[PDB]
């Protein structure tokens, strides 16, 4: 039994400096939710996010690769700073969690052995890495006052000579300098107050390569301008004034205002230097990137590209690449010139997932207010199988202004979705997508590379067929009969009147009276019997019910039930394949997973067969449509994000495996579903979690 992660769809965080790229390994690590996602852009078989670094207990607000080292720094909502170290090459292990701060970490710049940490305490401290150990220790901590850090840059002039540009709630740019003793810091002091800005400095960046050589320092503010300061070392002979000072009885330094670049109209957002050339990258408020360089000798814009959260500047193989994370949490690539393929993912907790009736693609609805379709492309535009069948977002059915709560596929060409809206709509697979899905995913229908972010959010939206009214609350769940002629719906409720089950027709999209009452709270799961003559319901009111189907009028009636199957909310339920038997299992907050089976012997009713308990609540349970050996296959998810694979036979659970902690989500498994399809001798598992990440595993 070999469990292999197939794909990870996570979205970047909305925060300054939440992403960084490794200058050497060319690995971009961005904070996605409470995890640090890793992705290799430059790659043969476009794969995308290949790992989610778990550790932080809050949203990651900053990620930085310490240059010239195997280290990386981080910071989260919980004022914590973590230090990772590359275990192998494309992976990192957390080796230290700094608890010291009780306020937000507003700034963070770190060189090989140091880490400047600006905090909302109004204090900026410098951590210095130990000599024998690998952990950092507070070498020094100070403050300017009224003054608060917003950003700071750390630089290395000479061997033990260091500079630190501090910018914050002060129109000025302070320049602290300290020497590096073997036990930390020595002679630290603010040695220069650079005047020039007419507002708060919110950006700083040093450019120090091959000195004696262009040693610049740029800085932005709450304006539409950027200032560049020239730095001379030992030979530095109205505003042509210099700020001289010296490190020790051996160094002299002279800063000076060189030029002001940003346009009057263009308001700047992000700014960073190039990895090797003397070029500055500045991204405007509106989606537009600009590159600046000298020569004359005046700084000028040498590259513009119109129509940000993050913006990475990197060059590989005599080509320049621009990675730009948008609002939809999607990264896009550009070379210099074409638009290479990027990566997609949610920006808010995922709520539901549902494979196409046949299982070639997987729809995913999240709180991002978007519904995405993920599929694997195993075909070049030439029609031959790709080496590795990678997963991508082939279409974004919608981006409505309603929080996507749930979805279920009616047909490979149509589906239904619901959100924090009163009604729910159905959607039809457009011509544009179908072709795309037929060409790369390979699926026949009746009547040269995946979608870049541009044609994925604008040209690939599914046209709505019909809306359905009835519920006076956001729809929580729903299922489609095996015959696809029915839809069982259920809204959010606190009483019995709204905790009603509505049955809709997929032909006339009209409701089919009468509604179904019983549950006193809100239903969490609705499943139709494999045969289709039954409907099951679990309703976080600690009970379940089975509604028999009248094959004539298609009206349902209550037959079986159980007022106390669980001591706490039931989160999920599922039916085993007919061959196994008239069985269905429920997953509950009471930590247990119970199995039920029809018994007409002592009296007609669905009796309890087996039951197992876990450590955390079981929020997701899905059983495979086919029978593995002569036994059934079940998957279980928890509030931990942990996933258990079980085997089941008349009264005996067999643990196949517990997905390594390194390959599973970081929070509540909102939904788990097996794909109906088997391809390349593998089974597929869809996993939507509360850590805003859609994932896909495979069982060999």
In the numeric block, the tokens 């778990």 are attached to 54
Task: Report the alpha-carbon distance of residue 210 to residue 439 in Å, rounded.
Answer: 51
Q: Give the residue from 343, 365, 385 where a domain finishes.
A: 343
CA atoms of 343 and 485, how far apart (whole Å): 36
Q: What are the two backbone dihedrals, phi and then psi, of residue 437, each rounded to the nearest 5 degrees?
A: -75, -25
455 and 573 belong to one structural domain: yes
Q: Could you say which of 319, 343, 367 is where a domain stops?
A: 343
Tokens for 208, please give them.
């120090």
Q: What is the DSSP string of 365-412?
A: EETTS-EEEEEEE---TTSS--SS-EEEEEEEEE--SS-EEEEEEEET
Q: Regarding beta strands 186-194 and 215-221, do their DSSP bridges make them parallel or antiparallel, or are they unpaired?
A: unpaired
Complete edge-to-edge strand list for the sheet that includes strand 362-366 = 350-355, 362-366, 371-377, 390-398
Q: Which two tokens stand for residue 563?
A: 């007022």
- What distance in Å separates the CA atoms of residue 286 and residue 204, rounded to the nearest whole number? 21
Same structural domain, 235 and 378: no
β-pairing, 525-528 vs 3-10, is unpaired
What is the Cα–Cα distance from 353 to 388, expressed in whole angstroms? 24
β-sheet bridge partners, residue 154 = 164
C-alpha closest to that of 203 among 143, 281, 133: 281
> Are residues 196 and 271 located together in one domain of the fold?
yes
CB 622 within 8 A of CB 634: yes
Cβ contacts of 261 within 8 Å, gap of 6 or more: 225, 226, 228, 280, 282, 292, 299, 301
Number of compact structural domains in the chain: 2
Question: Are 376 and 333 part of one and the same domain?
Answer: no
Whether 328 and 464 share a structural domain: no
- Identify whether residues 326 and 432 lie together within a single domain: no
Residues whose CB is less than 8 angstroms from the CB of residue 14 and which lie 6 or more positions away in sequence, other chains included: 309, 327, 347
Q: Rounded to 5 degrees, what angle do the CA atoms 674, 679, 683 make? A: 30
In terms of Cβ atoms closer than 10 Å to its own Cβ (0-12, 13-18, 19+), residue 428 is middle
Find residue 303's DSSP bridge partners: 291
Cα–Cα distance for residue pair 341/337, rounded to 1 Å: 13
Q: Provide the phi-psi class of 290: left if phi over 0, else alpha when psi is between -120 and 50, else beta.
A: beta
144 and 167 together in one domain:
yes
What letter would DSSP give residue 335?
Answer: B
Residue 425 contacts by C-beta under 8 Å, 6 or more apart in sequence?
Answer: 416, 417, 464, 465, 466, 467, 468
Question: What is the rounded distance in angstroms from the CA atom of residue 166 to the CA atom of residue 169?
Answer: 10
Residue from 156, 159, 108, 160 nearest 136 by CA = 108
Instruction: Find the domain containing 426 and state its range.
Output: 1-11+344-700
**Beta strand extents in 122-185 (DSSP E only):** 123-129, 136-143, 149-156, 161-168, 170-179
Q: Are the beta carbons of 697 and 376 closer than 8 angstroms?
A: no
Q: Is-contact 188 164, C-beta < 8 A?
A: no
Q: Is 219 left (phi over 0), alpha (psi -120 to 50) or beta?
A: beta
Instruction: List C-alpha distances in Å: 115 to 83, 127, 133, 144, 410.
Output: 10, 5, 16, 18, 54
Query: What resolution, expressed in A, was reported for this entry?
Result: 3.2
**In the listed set 323, 343, 363, which residue is the last one of a domain according to the structure?**
343
Residue 540's region, left for phi above 0, alpha for psi from -120 to 50, else beta, is: left
CA distance 327 to 457: 11
Instruction: Please choose, from the candidates 188, 176, 160, 152, the residue with its C-alpha nearest in 3D space to the C-alpha of residue 255.
Output: 176
**Whole-angstrom Cα distance, residue 461 to residue 480?**
23
Residue pair 98/84 in contact by the 8 Å Cβ criterion? no
Please report, for residues 215, 238, 245, the alpha-carbon distance to residue 175 in angstroms, rounded to integers and kept in the order given. Answer: 15, 21, 10
- Concatenating the DSSP letter of every residue in 621-657 gives EEE-SS-SSSSEEEEEEESS--EEEEEEETTEEEEEE
Q: Does 42 share its domain with 95? A: yes
Instruction: Please count the other Cβ atoms lying within 10 Å of the Cβ belonging to residue 227.
Output: 21
Residues 309 and 387 in one domain: no
Q: Which residue matches tokens 């996933």? A: 643
Query: Strands, DSSP E only, in 494-642?
Result: 501-505, 525-528, 534-538, 544-549, 556-562, 570-575, 583-588, 592-599, 605-613, 618-623, 632-638
Burial class (CB in 10 A: 0-12, 13-18, 19+), 446: exposed
**3-class DSSP assignment, residue 218:** strand
Looking at the fold, whether 414 and 513 belong to one and the same domain comes out as: yes
Specify whether 335 is located in the same domain as 375.
Answer: no
Residue 96 parent element (H or E): strand 92-98
Confirm if 284 and 266 have CB atoms less than 8 A apart.
yes
Q: Are residues 291 and 410 in the same domain?
A: no
Q: Omega before 212 cis (within 30°)?
A: yes
């Amino acid at each position: 039994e070999c469990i292999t992660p197939e794909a990870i769809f996570i979205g970047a965080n909305k925060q300054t400096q939440v992403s960084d790229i490794h200058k050497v390994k060319k690995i971009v690590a961005f904070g996605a939710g409470k995890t640090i996602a890793l992705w290799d852009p430059i790659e043969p078989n476009n794969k995308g996010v290949y790992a989610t670094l778990k550790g932080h207990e809050a949203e990651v607000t900053c990620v930085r690769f310490v240059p010239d080292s195997d280290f990386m720094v981080s910071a989260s909502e919980d004022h914590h700073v973590k230090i990772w170290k590359f275990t192998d090459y494309s992976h990192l292990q957390c080796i230290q969690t700094i608890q010291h701060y009780s306020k937000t970490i507003v700034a963070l710049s770190a060189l090989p052995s140091l880490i400047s940490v600006g905090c909302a305490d109004g204090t900026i401290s410098i951590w210095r890495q130990n000599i024998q150990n690998d952990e950092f220790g507070l070498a020094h901590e100070f403050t300017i006052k009224f003054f608060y850090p917003l950003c700071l840059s750390l630089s290395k002039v000479e061997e033990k000579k260091y500079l630190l540009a501090i910018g914050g709630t002060n129109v000025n740019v302070f320049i602290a300098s300290f020497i590096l003793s073997d036990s930390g810091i020595e002679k630290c002091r603010v040695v220069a107050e650079l005047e020039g800005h007419e507002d708060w400095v919110k950006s700083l960046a040093f450019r120090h390569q091959e000195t004696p050589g262009d040693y610049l320092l740029c800085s932005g503010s709450q304006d539409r301008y950027i200032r560049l300061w020239r730095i001379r070392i030992n030979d530095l002979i109205l505003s042509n004034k210099q700020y001289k000072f010296q490190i020790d009885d051996e160094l002299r330094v002279g800063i000076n205002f060189e030029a002001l670049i940003m346009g009057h109209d263009d308001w700047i957002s992000s700014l960073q230097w190039h990895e090797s050339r003397l070029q500055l990258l500045a991204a405007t408020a509106d989606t537009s990137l600009m590159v600046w360089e000298p020569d004359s000798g005046i700084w000028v814009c040498s590259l513009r590209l119109g129509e940000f959260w993050s913006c990475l500047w990197f060059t590989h193989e005599r080509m320049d690449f621009f990675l730009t994370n948008g609002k939809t949490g999607s990264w896009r690539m550009w070379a210099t010139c074409d638009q290479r393929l990027g990566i997609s993912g949610a920006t808010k907790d995922v709520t539901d997932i549902a494979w196409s009736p046949s299982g070639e693609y997987l729809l995913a609805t999240s709180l991002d207010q978007t519904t995405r379709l993920f599929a694997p492309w195993i075909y070049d535009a030439s029609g031959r199988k790709r080496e590795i069948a990678t997963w991508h977002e082939f279409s974004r059915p919608q981006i409505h202004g309603y929080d996507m709560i749930c979805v279920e596929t009616v047909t490979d060409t149509r589906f239904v979705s619901g959100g924090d809206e009163k009604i729910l709509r159905s959607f039809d697979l457009p011509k544009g997508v179908a072709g795309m899905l037929q060409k790369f995913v390979g699926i026949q229908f009746e009547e040269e590379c995946p979608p870049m972010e541009d044609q994925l959010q604008r040209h690939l939206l599914w046209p709505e067929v019909e809306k359905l009214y009835g519920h006076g609350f956001e729809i929580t769940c729903l299922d489609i009969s095996p015959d696809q002629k029915l839809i069982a719906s259920a809204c959010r409720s606190n009483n019995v009147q709204n905790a009603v089950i509505r049955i809709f027709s997929t032909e006339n999209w009209l409701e089919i009276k009468p509604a179904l009452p019983f549950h006193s709270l809100t239903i969490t799961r609705l499943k139709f019997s494999k045969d289709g003559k039954f409907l099951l319901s679990v309703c976080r009111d600690r009970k379940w019910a089975l509604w028999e189907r009248n094959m004539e009028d298609n009206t349902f009636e209550l037959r079986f039930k159980n007022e106390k199957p669980h001591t706490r909310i039931i989160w999920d339920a599922d039916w085993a394949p007919l061959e196994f038997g008239n069985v269905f299992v429920t997953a509950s907050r009471d930590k247990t997973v119970k199995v039920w089976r029809h018994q007409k012997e002592p009296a007609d009713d669905y009796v309890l067969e087996a039951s197992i308990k876990h450590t955390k609540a079981v929020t997701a349970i899905s059983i495979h449509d086919s029978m593995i050996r002569e036994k059934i296959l079940i998957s279980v998810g928890l509030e931990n994000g942990e996933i258990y694979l079980y085997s089941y036979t008349l009264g005996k659970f067999e643990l196949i495996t517990q997905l390594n902690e390194d390959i599973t989500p970081a929070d509540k498994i909102t939904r788990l579903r097996w794909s109906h399809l088997k391809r390349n001798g593998k089974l597929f598992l869809g996993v939507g979690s509360s850590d805003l990440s859609t994932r896909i595993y495979s069982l060999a």
